[PDB]
Symmetry: D2
């Protein structure tokens, strides 16, 4: 729509497209911060709407906001949650480090919309006001950090963790199914002593189980909300019960154990909870990177690699099955690693009463959660559930190796056993062929003595 | 549109939305790689279209493609360049590490579109074929790396460099204008010997000039194109003049000094050119971070900070002017730092004949170029051009410091000068008040001897 | 020299050294840079060998004479008697086999002498058959890594952290009544007390302590008993549990045998996670250190709200220039911890099949970070934190110089009017009171009684 | 002990040491970790002092007797006669003032003795007035950093890089006729020769060399003459150019005076950029090292296309297990360079106003990376690269076992038919020929003449 609406702020008037619900401040920011293409994540936008919804409910309970106004604001917030106004937040991540502009973005949209809901109009003659009504008892300084934690905790609880558990179950079922399949071990990439495929996979299972605990340990710090600390953390210009009540409200509407932060100065001055929580995520990325690599190397071939297992072929050189899911997973694991560095830099750069590197920090954090969650979900259903053993190749490899020589020690002594191994190695023979050439035992004795199942 | 079209590949048939120009392979990938929200950058998409346009022209010259087919394909590519099909590339960055799916994405769109252009229809009875005609003499392995370099070089030349030069000019004009303004120096954050504001700014100018040279030194390696090496770099299934001719064509249509890579094995097996080029970018980020911090600290206040300079106030506590542009710049500088780590990890992980971490590498690289280019452009027009000195504050600070005591040495000796400084420091007096209290010189002598302009 | 030998042949080792042929060969093959195994790791390795000897002895796999001699030799290493016997670079085999052998040879040769024997080829105790009994470089090195890691965190890092927290907590309490101007975006903001500002630092350290504590259980899991690939082949079924118990007893730390030896051998996950908490601490410390040096900046042209002890000599002609050196040392080491994390992440993500072979590099960075953080907190505490004092005059001067207090006037005079004097003060360069009186909107008496900064 | 003193008073320094009061004070204030200044940096600092003495002498600012004595003392440090005289930790003042003073005191005390004088308080040469004449820690430390950096790159890194390139170039030439199966996504792909594959490694190193060379000009710019804040206050107008010339002459490197001293003092930009090229080299080296160990994997259950020298002793009962140790050492140090870059980036982005104070940490990481890369390339070259040999039988076995060659049949038989035998071979587990003959689509003779792998 070409038609504009004249909206204004302390700096004056500015034209805002008529079909949009934002106001003067969002328009100015739009024209001043034309940097790249990254905008606030949908999850962050919703967490912000949830924050305003809770504040309005509590402001009402405290008699600070009229029931009518509070009711409309709450109704407008739910529409945002319903995903009806995704197009009303055009601001880039690269704005003021406090997230003030996005706070104002939400205030203007909620104000203009709540006004219409009350039978009013959008624009300067709106019935609900961005700062006076919607931002009542708040500050960008304590609101943005709160929305960050709400977004982060819910994402971890509802997206990441469930997917992690499902992948663990799948690998655990595989572990039990292949418990009896003996394969050759590999250390330093070299052939080594045997272990079952089930045991190898149990290592992957334990890794995921350990990661889950680590992620759980990071949750209580992210559950702490800054809301109530206002501008510098003192809680100036607020009702004494506000901080506790708004945290209770959020906990109630989300069903998550949110608590108000015991120290508001630590909550406004840093992003410590997220720096620590992301530390657990980069650990999960390192574990996943290893599991994904093991899978693609074990399935390499089909003739000139390892080929001990086969994985589902999902896309359209006969046996050339590219391990694409493994490639998407390893690539996103590198991304999480780099995201951690950007986060550490921003988290270490707070000054005095406020950390102004917030948009960037939350941008990287929510991206890593999405990547890890969707990545495991994709890897699980498009690869993990269909992992199968190439029993013939496995056995071929086992019998061609020199590692089974240890089974002969108790029967013929170390010296003769090592002699057999050396001969087979220098001459390019199998352990059996060498043993028989030397005449140290009969083929029947070899077949009875070398049982890989007793490794 | 709910209506589908039945398209197929080696794996079978799949429904594709009727209003879309992509085919079977793009649809399968769409359903297999639902990971996060990041898709290929517009710049990469265009570079890919440019690559196909050049290959078609050369295939024509070699008599490998009919003039009609080649002409249509070229015409379809220009529409992509004109930005008419931005909605035809829905694939995520998190796909096969070679960029095969995006290569196929471009092949299908170009095929279906060129078909219509020839008076045909889209779908299975298309006149132009994705692999046979559009991917003729190519492979995903050499095409994606080529599109990466075309995108990277043009972005550096047309976006980054021009903005860098403009910012340098602005700071250079400021340097000359404030050449005569003496201010207090600061080392370790402590007061130190004087220097002019013009000199301080010249340091910023030299930093930018040095960065430009470094960035220029990285350009020749990125100008090398892998096109012609095919699957493993041997150039199997290609015309001997193809590699040279396609590089010439691209150089001609872009006006950039593109050359075919002297070693195709180094070109397909690594992302070395970009790892090195991004090293120069993280250097520019470190320099910019410093310039941005200097600016915000020098302008801090308006009463309880430094306040030596004032910057344009761009948004709506009277003197409280938040240095928002400085905050957007410092935040993106941290992002470039983290991007470098993800890139280094992917670049170090190539295996044998191919590096399969490409989508992620190019995703991070183009983001850093956009961030740095738009960041300097924004910082320049919304802050740098309007930097002004608070001459009164500067002079106040100068006269209140103890650092000017050095001017008295040649007149009264080191011992008396240090005595004056110690007294002023312990008692909280100005150098003049202390000197007069001691009676070592007259006020007229002080005023004549301590001339900060001769630092 | 002396002539020692292995399967590859004989080689000359200096007569005055207790190491064998394998260590000598490595000394010639891995001449990379100057980094060697840190003392903490050397001790953790000796402790692993000491515990293995006791259990082997208990199971009847090793004779008392040999077991006791190996333990005695191990104790000498712990006593700092053999520091020059470990010349190997960190940049060796990724499994740490070289260092496992370095310990095996030194312990065997010395245990020989301890039994009235001689060092070298004619030794009574054997490095591989005796000292390395029931073990493998594969499960021994990871065990030594966890022992050194857990002990460094519990004995060095945690106590120093607690001490620094107690100091800043005292300061928070002592300056609880001093009101100062807040700063957001580096701009003048509403007031808070120096005590509240310092309590923020305190809360940061308290949170970090709990994060570090949550990482200890995974680090306490030991790989010993996993043997070559984690199956435990060639070990008594009670070996793994017994050796873990032995290690717990002699170190007084809650060590346990890893429930899954495959996870233990194939990864460095516990350390990747434990280090995540360390870089978390580095980000917090960087912030605290920066606040301190900025607050102490000056003496005349900065902020100068606090004063810190001057430790290094200065120039007679330049009194007042007190460079915040402890803050500079601390911020530099914090940048180092961040870089260390990246190196550890890359090595930790690179394991293949049954064994991660980036171990020497991972333990090198991990132990350095712990060393940096513990010594850094102690130094900053003793030479800076304990001496933080407020410059009460500047603090009040700035407070009464800012336009931020105009807020208190709003409740006594309309927003526009209160803001009116603020505009004049700002524009004319006057103070809130000067402008208020000059504008005749109030009197000195009522202004002073209205603008109460100590009431927030 | 001996009693030395400064402006803060006197303090006891061990009699057998040449350092003064300032160094002793720092020794007590900065007891952080175990890292000290590296020898290369110590030498670069002595060289800076030696050059400063000559110019001061030439300008008539210093007496011949003192100047010559200071230069003689400086040369003794270069000769390795005073390594134990620099005990200071890297984690000190961010400007490197402590280390500048450590050099000033050691040089003054020694120069005193050299003039028939005594070390300590009664010295004939003065650390601050004589040795530090016309200088400041601010412009001296950055100068020493560039001198050490440029020299390490030109003398150590570049020659080793060239050597490794020459070796791999020889191998590329020697194996130019050996055809092998290509691998993309870790899957069997079309053929290429071992020589072509190795030429890729060669091209990588050649490109890296030029990138490293492009970074040298900025590193050659010196800060000396910039003095405290870069203005050059208290220096003769010819000082900066003369001292740069002097340094160029005695080191034989193209050192020049920095055109803008403010950029020189306020940043570490040259090193941030030069190190970008180093991490670039680390990514390349990591890839080459991985290809080598994967290609040599086995001996029976891996790829096993090549063989590499066995350097460490193995087990008699386990012949064939050759762990790629040089590759492991190399990959670990490459991860280290990546982490180092992060630490350097953070310090380099943190300068404030007239001076960057993260210098000791930046030079610490930079010199380590150079050390790691140079020694790593030498070790990998001598103990691995020179000994790479192809296992011709396995290479052919794999080549004739893959279905990839079916491509050559297409030109002699329709796509579908050629693919038909491939399907059978794959499904039935037969070889291309076995399936082709069993399907009766051709004869042994025509198959062999059609499938020519050596014709790509
Ligand atoms: C209309 Si007025 C200016 C009072 C206003 C007030 C407010 O935002 O609190 C608005 O709606 O923007
Ligand atoms: C129609 Si067919 C299957 C031959 C085809 C061919 C091709 O893609 O080269 C296509 O258009 O997809
Ligand atoms: C002397 Si022998 C070779 C038996 C030997 C044995 C061993 O290490 O187990 C040694 O001391 O190295
Ligand atoms: C002995 Si005095 C104090 C003059 C002195 C002088 C100096 O350093 O310039 C020293 O050697 O330290």
């Amino acid at each position: 729509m070409n038609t504009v609406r004249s909206e204004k702020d302390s700096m004056g008037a500015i034209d805002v497209p008529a079909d949009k619900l934002w106001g003067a401040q969002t328009q100015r920011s739009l024209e001043h911060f034309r940097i790249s293409t990254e905008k606030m994540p949908t999850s962050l936008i919703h967490a912000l709407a949830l924050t305003k919804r809770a504040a309005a409910k509590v402001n009402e309970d405290l008699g600070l906001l009229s029931e009518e106004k509070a009711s409309a604001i709450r109704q407008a917030a739910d529409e945002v949650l319903a995903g009806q106004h995704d197009d009303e937040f055009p601001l880039a991540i690269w704005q003021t480090g406090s997230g003030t502009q996005s706070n104002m973005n939400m205030n203007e949209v909620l104000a203009n919309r709540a006004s219409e809901l009350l039978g009013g109009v959008r624009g300067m003659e709106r019935k609900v006001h961005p700062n006076d009504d919607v931002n009542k008892s708040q500050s960008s300084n304590d609101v943005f950090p709160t929305a960050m934690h709400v977004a982060a905790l819910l994402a971890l609880r509802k997206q990441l963790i469930p997917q992690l558990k499902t992948l663990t179950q799948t690998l655990n079922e595989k572990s039990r199914a292949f418990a009896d399949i003996v394969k050759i071990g590999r250390t330093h990439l070299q052939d080594a002593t045997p272990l079952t495929l089930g045991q190898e996979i149990s290592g992957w299972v334990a890794m995921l189980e350990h990661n889950l605990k680590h992620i759980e340990y990071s949750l209580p710090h992210v559950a702490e909300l800054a809301l109530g600390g206002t501008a510098v953390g003192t809680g100036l210009n607020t009702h004494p019960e506000y901080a506790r009540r708004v945290a209770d409200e959020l906990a109630v509407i989300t069903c998550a154990p949110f608590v108000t932060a015991p120290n508001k100065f630590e909550a406004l001055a840093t992003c410590d909870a997220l720096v620590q929580a992301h530390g657990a995520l980069k650990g999960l990325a390192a574990s996943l990177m290893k599991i994904a690599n093991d899978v693609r190397w074990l399935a390499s071939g089909p003739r000139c690699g390892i080929g001990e297992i086969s994985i589902p072929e999902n896309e359209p050189m006969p046996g050339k099955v590219n391990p694409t899911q493994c490639e998407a997973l390893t690539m996103l694991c590198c991304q999480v690693m780099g995201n951690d560095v950007a986060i550490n830099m921003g988290g270490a750069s707070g000054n005095f009463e406020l950390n102004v590197f917030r948009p960037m920090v939350i941008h990287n954090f929510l991206q890593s959660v999405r990547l890890l969650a969707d990545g495991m979900e994709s890897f699980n259903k498009h690869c993990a559930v269909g992992i199968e053993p190439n029993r013939e190749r496995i056995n071929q490899l086992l019998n061609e190796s020199l590692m089974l020589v240890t089974a002969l020690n108790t029967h013929i002594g170390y010296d003769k056993a090592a002699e057999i191994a050396k001969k087979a190695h220098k001459e390019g023979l199998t352990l059996k062929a060498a043993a028989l050439a030397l005449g140290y035992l009969s083929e029947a004795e070899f077949d009875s003595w070398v049982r890989p199942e007793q490794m």
